[PDB]
Design a protein around this ligand. Structure first.
Ligand SMILES: [Cl-]
Length: 471
């Protein structure tokens, strides 16, 4: 005795459940799915021995490494939710078609989203759009990346794009802005590596990001504190986010960035699992607002009163003796409650603007005024003078620069590195080839590091899954 709308809404909502994969705690101390996408950039380390940063630092990542199981299983659980949701939504006859059309658009968006993470992380993956009971053989095989894009990701998004979905939503639901942001990213990536689909894919990308700009439904934040203010959840720049709230899931990842066993917080322990490198921090332009104390980074704080005896010096001031990420410092959570209700972004407007500039310059071979203005707005917020253009290549590298500098530690950089096969060198500021890059610790990237391994557990369950080269 659910009404038709309640039943349809529940099916639609089931598609959101495995959004936990984009930021959730995993087995280990201070282990979280977000670490997989930060540990290979060479711009983060760990003070936490249990995070398995070592495998990543040593270039000894294997089918037994952390995170990869969580990413595979939860993305595929999400996809199973979506496939069943879409089958059942199609069987509603009496309920308003417009309402059902919207709901199915949300689910198709989600299926595309899960698969887009899967293909970027693991490469070829099983191509599953049917409910499990209607599959012919459950020992599936990995299908080519190109097929996942052409048969699942792109058609899902193109159909969602032609639906009745609202353009924006401030409560956390999928919106047309989310569809356009994802589809911009899909086409931009399709044009890059591995697929190298053709320049027209840059133009298809630029169309979508431009639609988001022209909508006037999103605005740039004027400062950086908004990225760590719970009151800004689902508003301002934010297009799609993982939802954290006091009455649902708390954002435990806040503790990941805090200096290990330091006592600066209300949490029982700070993890210190994601620490920026000194070399990355020192690579920002001189006078950048982002490197000012307690903008993106911090170097001192005070000991929390629950952690030190009254009159301890630590209560007045503590030098942390290094750079730490302050970008996500939910101050109420850290100082008082130990229950962060700060959302984690999947897409925000700054990313979409830089995706427009990148696609546009790649399609047209020369920046237009909109792209020039985007780079200067992002630079202006950082207290930097406007960018003096010299050529299309220098402009593309400046867009890349602002992606590194503005979007750092937001799970974007690793994906940028894979689609360009370029890594920004901290010392010289030059974009060097991924294959041949030497890290701070003497290790050299090869073709192997372009993908993560298929988890050993999945391969032992299903020996029809091949493995990525080198693993
Ligand atoms: Cl089933």
């Amino acid at each position: 005795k659910l009404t038709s709308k309640e039943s349809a809404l529940a099916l639609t909502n089931s598609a959101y459940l495995k959004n936990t994969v984009f930021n959730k705690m995993t087995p280990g101390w201070g282990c979280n799915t977000i670490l997989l996408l930060e540990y290979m950039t060479g711009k983060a380390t760990s003070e936490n021995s249990q995070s398995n940063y070592k495998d990543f630092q040593d270039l000894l990542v294997s089918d037994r490494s952390l995170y990869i199981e969580d990413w595979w299983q939860d993305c595929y659980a999400g996809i199973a939710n979506c496939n069943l949701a879409l089958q059942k939504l199609g069987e509603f006859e009496n309920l308003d078609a417009s309402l059902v059309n919207g709901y199915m658009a949300e689910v198709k968006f989600m299926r595309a989203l899960y698969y887009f993470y899967l293909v970027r992380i693991f490469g070829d993956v099983p191509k599953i759009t049917t409910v499990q009971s209607e599959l012919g053989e459950l020992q599936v095989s990995r299908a080519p990346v190109k097929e996942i894009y052409d048969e699942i990701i792109i058609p899902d998004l193109l159909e969602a794009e032609q639906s009745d979905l609202a353009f924006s939503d401030h409560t956390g639901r999928v919106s047309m802005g989310a569809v356009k942001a994802l589809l911009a990213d899909v086409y931009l990536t399709y044009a890059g590596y591995p697929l190298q689909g053709g320049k027209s894919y840059y133009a298809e990308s630029a169309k979508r990001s431009l639609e988001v700009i022209k909508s006037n439904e999103y605005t740039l934040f004027t400062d950086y504190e908004s990225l760590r203010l719970p009151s800004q959840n689902n508003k301002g720049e934010f297009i799609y986010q993982v939802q954290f709230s006091l009455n649902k899931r708390h954002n435990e990842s806040v503790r990941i960035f805090l200096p290990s066993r330091s006592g600066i917080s209300a949490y029982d322990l700070e993890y210190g699992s994601l620490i920026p490198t000194k070399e990355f921090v020192e690579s920002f332009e001189k006078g950048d607002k982002r490197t000012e104390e307690k903008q993106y980074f911090f170097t001192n704080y005070k000991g929390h009163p629950s952690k030190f005896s009254p009159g301890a010096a630590e209560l007045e001031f503590m030098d942390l003796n290094g750079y730490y990420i302050y970008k996500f410092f939910d101050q109420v959570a850290v100082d008082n409650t130990a229950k962060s209700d700060l959302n984690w972004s999947v897409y925000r407007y700054t990313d979409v603007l830089l995706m427009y500039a990148e696609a546009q310059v790649n399609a047209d071979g020369t920046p237009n005024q909109q792209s020039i203005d985007i780079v200067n707005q992002i630079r202006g917020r950082a207290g930097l003078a406007p960018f003096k253009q010299t050529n299309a290549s220098a402009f593309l590298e400046e867009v890349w620069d602002q992606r590194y500098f503005d979007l750092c530690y937001e799970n974007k950089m690793w994906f940028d590195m894979l689609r360009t096969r370029k890594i920004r060198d901290d010392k010289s500021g030059e974009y060097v080839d991924f294959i041949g890059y030497k890290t701070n610790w003497g290790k050299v990237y090869t073709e192997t590091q372009l993908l993560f391994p298929i988890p050993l557990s999945e391969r032992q369950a299903n020996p029809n899954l091949t493995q990525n080269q080198g693993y």
